[PDB]
């Protein structure tokens, strides 16, 4: 069967068994990451070796281990002890989140700070947040979470409406010690509630919305075979799932007549970073890498039919490992369906008398994740005409603070006394390209303005220019919306019928990239987010733009170290890393629950096909 098939409960139980038998999974051990490894480049002699990569944490303080396991042969391949003070800590465990509030509740410094605010400790929730790397030398080599407090007036109250500003604590979650409690002063706790299901806030619900029924009376046009292989309207792909990256698309290819033509070997969101722009000591450390530090797949929602996914939905229910190696199913974690997408092509020709209209549609593959106050949707779209699009949907409840009485240059006021610090949500798409095969190159395409003069006497001409990126050292590129800058991924050895190299064009949204000072800690750890486009030469171990162990790593790992190798990328197996993000200055309308905002990118064919690939679409029924 397919080596790209989803992990099954049996494979995960068998990994647990192999590890136990090898002496690697005793009672002090916890699995912080488990995922299948992709087949090797040809080296994997077809056959089949289902290999799994495991990060094992030790709750007694011993060194963690990276282990690779073969479940086909039931053996441990390698087990390396990690020096986390050098190469970074493991991802946060779910059980460590719950520990922060409990420890703080019995710490004299925390209780004193709460008493000075006349707050009941049984009503104070603590958001446990990743720690980053700053000036505290005692944290190097230690698993640290930081806590910010919110008041919950009653169990169904939205705590985010009641931030306790001026207060932050740092917690060692392995030795279970409170290392620091910082109290810069008392701020009023905002009193208005933010309960968006309370009739007192919502008013009477609308009665004016009539139903929209979307049905497919003959079922959907896509087929699913082998659990996760999709065929739809000439597209072919495998839908993977990884506890860290979430949904991963493999082997995206398009059937152009008789031949299956590869386009993208692997597509994923390989990292995301959420940096905050509030210089207050209470929050100036606040950054999370939701993918690399928390593992966004682990927090995927079960998606409800008619609510989260409307229409004729096919579901995938991926299996991940819990902290002890037992399989855990995310029921209805992935939604797949096709959607009408308006007009595809249209022309009414006067001379021929032919009127022609065809409708477009797209395949949708999506999942949603929730981490704390944030909710992120990840949407991959495939269109009839060969376009591939990614869209992130950001929603949830904004992270709050007090609003200072004299105003602020870095915080929005949402309600009396209630602030929302400025922040970004930045994503890194990793696109292991395979445009008609693995010999690919990237060109930067700019519009070129021409001057009125000889050969252009009316001053109307304009053109474009393409610059080939030949080595990694020249392949760190910035957007330029004003010159219409795009990037083309082409195959110099595969030509269309016009004898031009086949290609795909990447259209970015040209949003601002990382705003932090280039000397900041976050600029070093999130270096990928400072540029719009990176191209690297493929390597099996270069998976994430931040490195493998993002939690509490000092920085520089990942992309800036990969590109220092200065490898040849001109007609080679290459990987495109695209940074794109939202800059969020929260508005009153984002409160008390925020409407979705979106960002993404798209790839459109650029002389990939010999003519329009949608000539054979029939007239609408």
Q: Which of residues 227-266 bind a copy of itself (CB under 8 A)?
A: 233
Of the candidates 276, 374, 504, 544, the residue annotated as catalytic is 374
One DSSP character per residue, 400-460 reads -EEPPTT--SSEEEEETTEEEE-EEEEEEEEEEE-TTSS-BEEEEEEEEE--SBTTBTTS-
Write 72-78 long-range contacts (CB < 8 A, 24+): 72/48, 73/49, 74/14, 74/18, 75/18, 76/18, 76/19, 76/22, 76/24, 77/51
In the complex, minimum distance from the CB of residue 69 to a copy of itself, in angstroms, rounded to a whole number: 32
- Selected range binding a copy of itself among 69-77, 164-172, 202-210, 542-550, rule: CB under 8 A: 202-210
Does 588 bind a copy of itself (CB under 8 A)? Our answer is yes
Burial 219-236 (b: 16+ CB within 10 A, else e): ebebeeeeebbbebbbbb
Q: Write phi, then psi, for 299 (nearest 5 degrees).
A: -105, 20
Kindly identify the residues of this chain, within the stretch 459-478, that bind a copy of itself according to CB under 8 A: 459-464
Does 573 bind Na ion (CB under 5 A)? Our answer is yes
29-36, strands of its sheet edge to edge: 29-36, 51-58, 65-70, 75-81
In the complex, minimum distance from the CB of residue 81 to a copy of itself, in angstroms, rounded to a whole number: 33
- Selected range binding a copy of itself among 65-73, 175-183, 392-400, 538-546, rule: CB under 8 A: 392-400
The smaller minimum CB distance to a copy of itself, of residues 494 and 511, is found at 511
**What residues form DSSP beta bridges with 446?**
465
Site string for Na ion, 395-434 (x = CB under 5 A): -------------------------------------xx-
In the complex, minimum distance from the CB of residue 340 to a copy of itself, in angstroms, rounded to a whole number: 5
> Can you tell me which of 80, 260, 481, 539 binds a copy of itself, judged by CB under 8 A?
481
The smaller minimum CB distance to a copy of itself, of residues 301 and 470, is found at 301
In the complex, minimum distance from the CB of residue 210 to a copy of itself, in angstroms, rounded to a whole number: 4
Is residue 333 within 8 A of residue 301, CB to CB? The reply is yes
Q: HSE on the CB side for 307, CA within 13 Å?
A: 6
- Selected range binding a copy of itself among 53-61, 534-542, 543-551, 581-589, rule: CB under 8 A: 581-589
Does 436 bind a copy of itself (CB under 8 A)? Our answer is no
Residue whose token pair is 């229409």? 311
Q: HSE on the CB side for 134, CA within 13 Å?
A: 14
Does 519 bind a copy of itself (CB under 8 A)? Our answer is yes
Choose the one of Cu ion, Na ion, a copy of itself, none that binds residue 99, judging by a C-beta under 5 to 8 angstroms depending on kind. Answer: none
Would the annotation count 446 as a binding residue?
A: no
Does 611 bind a copy of itself (CB under 8 A)? Our answer is yes
Kindly identify the residues of this chain, within the stretch 542-601, that bind Cu ion according to CB under 5 A: 584
Q: CA–CA separation, 528 vs 272, rounded Å?
A: 10
The smaller minimum CB distance to a copy of itself, of residues 46 and 457, is found at 457
Choose the one of a copy of itself, Cu ion, Na ion, none that binds residue 45, judging by a C-beta under 5 to 8 angstroms depending on kind. Answer: none
In the complex, minimum distance from the CB of residue 391 to a copy of itself, in angstroms, rounded to a whole number: 9
Q: CA–CA separation, 481 vs 195, rounded Å?
A: 41
Would the annotation count 610 as a binding residue?
A: no
Does 566 bind a copy of itself (CB under 8 A)? Our answer is no
Q: What is the DSSP letter of 609?
A: S
By C-alpha distance, which of 240, 523, 194, 239 is closest to 373? 194
- Selected range binding a copy of itself among 26-34, 38-46, 103-111, 511-519, rule: CB under 8 A: 511-519
The smaller minimum CB distance to Na ion, of residues 265 and 424, is found at 265
Asked if 290 is an active-site residue, the reply is yes
- Decide: residue 354, CB within 10 A, 0-12 exposed, 13-18 middle, 19+ buried: exposed
By C-alpha distance, which of 431, 401, 394, 396 is closest to 415? 401
**What residues form DSSP beta bridges with 574?**
537
Choose the one of Cu ion, Na ion, a copy of itself, none that binds residue 584, judging by a C-beta under 5 to 8 angstroms depending on kind. Answer: Cu ion
Choose the one of a copy of itself, Cu ion, Na ion, none that binds residue 452, judging by a C-beta under 5 to 8 angstroms depending on kind. Answer: a copy of itself
Of the candidates 38, 290, 532, 548, the residue annotated as catalytic is 290
Would the annotation count 425 as a binding residue?
A: yes
In the complex, minimum distance from the CB of residue 86 to a copy of itself, in angstroms, rounded to a whole number: 23
Write 527-531 long-range contacts (CB < 8 A, 24+): 527/555, 527/556, 527/558, 527/559, 527/560, 528/271, 528/428, 528/558, 528/559, 528/577, 528/579, 529/273, 529/426, 529/428, 529/579, 529/581, 530/579, 531/476, 531/477, 531/478, 531/579
Would the annotation count 26 as a binding residue?
A: no
Choose the one of a copy of itself, Na ion, Cu ion, none that binds residue 432, judging by a C-beta under 5 to 8 angstroms depending on kind. Answer: Na ion
What's the sign of the alpha-carbon dihedral 515, 520, 525, 530?
A: positive
Q: What is the DSSP letter of 12?
A: H
Would the annotation count 297 as a binding residue?
A: yes
Does 337 bind Cu ion (CB under 5 A)? Our answer is no
By C-alpha distance, which of 388, 367, 364 is closest to 377? 367
Site string for Na ion, 428-467 (x = CB under 5 A): ----xx----------------------------------
> Can you tell me which of 65, 84, 130, 158 binds a copy of itself, judged by CB under 8 A?
158
Asked if 379 is an active-site residue, the reply is no
Site string for a copy of itself, 300-329 (x = CB under 8 A): -x--x-xxx-x-------------------
The smaller minimum CB distance to a copy of itself, of residues 410 and 491, is found at 410
* Sheet strands (E) in 462-573: 462-469, 476-477, 486-495, 501-508, 533-537
Burial 274-303 (b: 16+ CB within 10 A, else e): bbbbbebebbbbbbbbbbbbbbbbbbbeeb
Burial 176-203 (b: 16+ CB within 10 A, else e): eebeebebeeebebbeebbbeeeeeeee
- Selected range binding Na ion among 149-157, 397-405, 566-574, 585-593, rule: CB under 5 A: 566-574
What kind and span of H or E run contains 528? none
Q: CA–CA separation, 417 vs 235, rounded Å?
A: 53
3-class secondary structure, 91: coil
Would the annotation count 296 as a binding residue?
A: yes
- Selected range binding a copy of itself among 10-18, 171-179, 535-543, 579-587, rule: CB under 8 A: 579-587
Residues in touch with Cu ion (CB under 5 A):
584
Binding-site annotation, residues for substrate:
288-299, 371-376
Residues in touch with Na ion (CB under 5 A):
432-433, 538, 573
Binding-site annotation, residues:
288-299, 371-376, 423, 425, 584
Binding-site annotation, residues for Cu cation:
423, 425, 584
- Give catalytic residue positions: 290, 374
């Amino acid at each position: 069967a397919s080596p790209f098939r989803l992990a099954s409960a049996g494979e995960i139980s068998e990994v647990q068994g192999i590890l136990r038998t090898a002496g690697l999974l005793g009672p002090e051990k916890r699995i912080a990451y488990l995922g299948v490894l992709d087949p090797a480049r040809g080296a994997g002699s077809e056959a089949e070796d289902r290999r799994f990569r495991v990060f094992i944490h030790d709750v007694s303080g011993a060194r963690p281990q990276e282990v690779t396991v073969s479940v086909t042969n039931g053996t441990v391949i390698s087990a390396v002890e990690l020096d986390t003070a050098a190469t970074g800590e493991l991802p946060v465990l779910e059980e460590e989140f719950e520990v922060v509030e409990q420890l703080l509740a019995t710490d004299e410094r925390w209780l004193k700070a709460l008493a000075a605010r006349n707050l009941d400790v049984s009503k104070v929730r603590v958001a446990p947040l990743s720690a980053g790397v700053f000036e505290y030398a005692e944290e190097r080599g230690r698993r640290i979470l930081r806590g910010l407090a919110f008041v919950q007036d009653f169990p169904e109250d939205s705590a985010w409406a009641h931030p306790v500003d001026g207060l932050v604590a740092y917690v060692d979650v392995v030795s279970k010690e409170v290392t620091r409690v910082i109290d810069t002063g008392v701020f009023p706790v905002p009193a208005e509630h933010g309960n968006y299901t309370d009739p007192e806030l919502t008013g009477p619900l609308r009665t004016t919305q009539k139903p929209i029924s979307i049905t497919q009376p003959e079922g959907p046009s896509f087929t699913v075979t082998g659990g996760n292989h999709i065929e739809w309207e000439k597209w072919s792909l495998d839908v993977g799932f990884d506890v860290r990256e979430g949904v991963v698309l493999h082997n995206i290819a398009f059937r152009d007549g008789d031949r299956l033509r590869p386009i993208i070997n692997r597509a994923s969101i390989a990292e995301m970073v959420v940096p905050y722009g509030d210089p207050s000591p209470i929050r100036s450390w606040q950054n999370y890498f939701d993918t690399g530090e928390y593992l966004v797949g682990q927090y995927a929602n079960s998606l409800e039919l008619g609510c989260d996914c409307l229409g004729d939905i096919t579901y995938l229910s991926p299996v991940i490992s819990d902290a002890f190696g037992n399989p855990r199913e995310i029921r209805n974690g992935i939604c797949m369906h096709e959607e009408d997408w308006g007009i595809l092509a249209k022309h009414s020709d006067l001379w021929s008398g032919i009127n022609y209209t065809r409708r477009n549609r797209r395949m949708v593959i999506s999942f949603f994740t929730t981490i704390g106050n944030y909710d992120y949707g990840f949407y991959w779209y495939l269109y009839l005409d060969g376009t591939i699009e990614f869209e992130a949907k950001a929603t949830g409840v904004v992270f709050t603070s007090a609003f200072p009485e004299g105003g602020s240059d870095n915080i929005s006021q949402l309600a009396p006394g209630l602030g929302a610090p400025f922040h970004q949500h930045i994503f890194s798409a990793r696109l292991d390209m395979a445009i008609d095969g693995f010999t690919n190159r990237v060109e930067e395409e700019d519009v070129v303005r021409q001057t009125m003069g000889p050969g252009n006497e009316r001053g109307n001409a304009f053109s474009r220019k393409r610059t080939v990126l030949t080595r990694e050292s020249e392949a760190v590129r910035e957007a330029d919306a004003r010159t219409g800058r795009t990037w083309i991924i082409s195959n110099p050895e595969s030509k269309n019928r016009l004898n031009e190299p086949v290609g795909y064009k990447l259209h970015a949204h040209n949003q601002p990239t990382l705003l932090a000072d280039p000397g900041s800690s976050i600029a070093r750890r999130a270096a990928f987010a400072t540029k719009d486009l990176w191209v690297t030469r493929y390597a099996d171990d270069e998976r994430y733009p931040t490195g493998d162990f993002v939690n509490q790593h000092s920085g520089g790992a990942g992309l800036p170290s990969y590109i220092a190798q200065d490898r040849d990328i001109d007609g080679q197996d290459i990987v495109v890393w695209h940074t794109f993000g939202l800059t969020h200055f929260p508005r009153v309308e984002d409160w008390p629950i925020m409407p979705v905002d979106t960002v993404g990118f798209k790839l459109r064919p650029e002389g990939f096909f010999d003519r329009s690939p949608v000539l054979d679409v029939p007239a609408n029924p």
